RNA sequence: AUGGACCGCCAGUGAUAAGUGGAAUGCCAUGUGGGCUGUCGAGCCCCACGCACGUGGGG
């Protein structure tokens, strides 16, 4: 939220929302001016979408201790078919979604982090089923 | 008022140059179209004349 001098914008994040630049032409017109808020539902929606697959495309810039480069990486499964199998409910199918996990070492996701990520360095490698589950960052 | 409404695939362009289908070839040999046979009274009207048998002029 610091560090980012402009916003990229509602119609930035969604998908099938013309950002910025785009031609607006279909998916409804969105002029990025006056934008009609998400609701915060659907954002979460937009939002899974996008740390799965993502743009991977130059965004909007953040400094970093002085290292600015608008540069956006693409997401970590762009352009696959995942395939979940299913049972009569969501229970066992859910169950059977379960991975089996290799041993080694234990691993957190992303969301289970109780440490805010450092941007410089190297994402460090996760034997853990949250780091094979591409959960980890 | 429909995963819809609005909405160009589009700006350019010799298929060109050349070329015998050519040499030879009887549809030939045979045949009655025949018998019968003469072309010899309604015609519609007006008028004139008449011996009322018909005669004559005009359409």
Redesign the pocket.
Not at 4 to 9: I, V
Not at 73 to 101: C, D, K, M, Q, W
Not at 111 to 136: H, M, T, V
């Given at each position: 939220r610091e560090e980012c001098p402009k916003t990229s914008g509602v119609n930035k994040l969604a998908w099938g929302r013309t950002a910025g630049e785009n031609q607006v032409?279909?998916?409804?017109?969105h002029h990025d001016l006056d934008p009609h808020p998400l609701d915060s539902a659907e954002a979460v929606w937009h939002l899974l979408a996008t740390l799965g697959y993502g743009p991977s495309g130059m965004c909007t810039a953040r400094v970093v201790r002085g290292r600015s480069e608008r540069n956006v990486t693409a997401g970590p499964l762009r352009g696959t078919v995942s395939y979940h199998p299913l049972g009569r409910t969501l229970f066992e199918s859910l169950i059977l979604n379960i991975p089996y996990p290799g041993t080694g070492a234990a691993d957190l996701a992303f969301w289970e982090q109780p440490e805010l990520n450092d941007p410089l360095g190297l994402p460090e490698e996760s034997a853990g089923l949250a780091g094979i589950l591409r959960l980890d960052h």
């Amino acid at each position: 939220r610091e560090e980012c001098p402009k916003t990229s914008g509602v119609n930035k994040l969604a998908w099938g929302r013309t950002a910025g630049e785009n031609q607006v032409w279909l998916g409804g017109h969105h002029h990025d001016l006056d934008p009609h808020p998400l609701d915060s539902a659907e954002a979460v929606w937009h939002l899974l979408a996008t740390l799965g697959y993502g743009p991977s495309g130059m965004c909007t810039a953040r400094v970093v201790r002085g290292r600015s480069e608008r540069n956006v990486t693409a997401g970590p499964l762009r352009g696959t078919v995942s395939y979940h199998p299913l049972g009569r409910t969501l229970f066992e199918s859910l169950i059977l979604n379960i991975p089996y996990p290799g041993t080694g070492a234990a691993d957190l996701a992303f969301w289970e982090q109780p440490e805010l990520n450092d941007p410089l360095g190297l994402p460090e490698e996760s034997a853990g089923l949250a780091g094979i589950l591409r959960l980890d960052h």
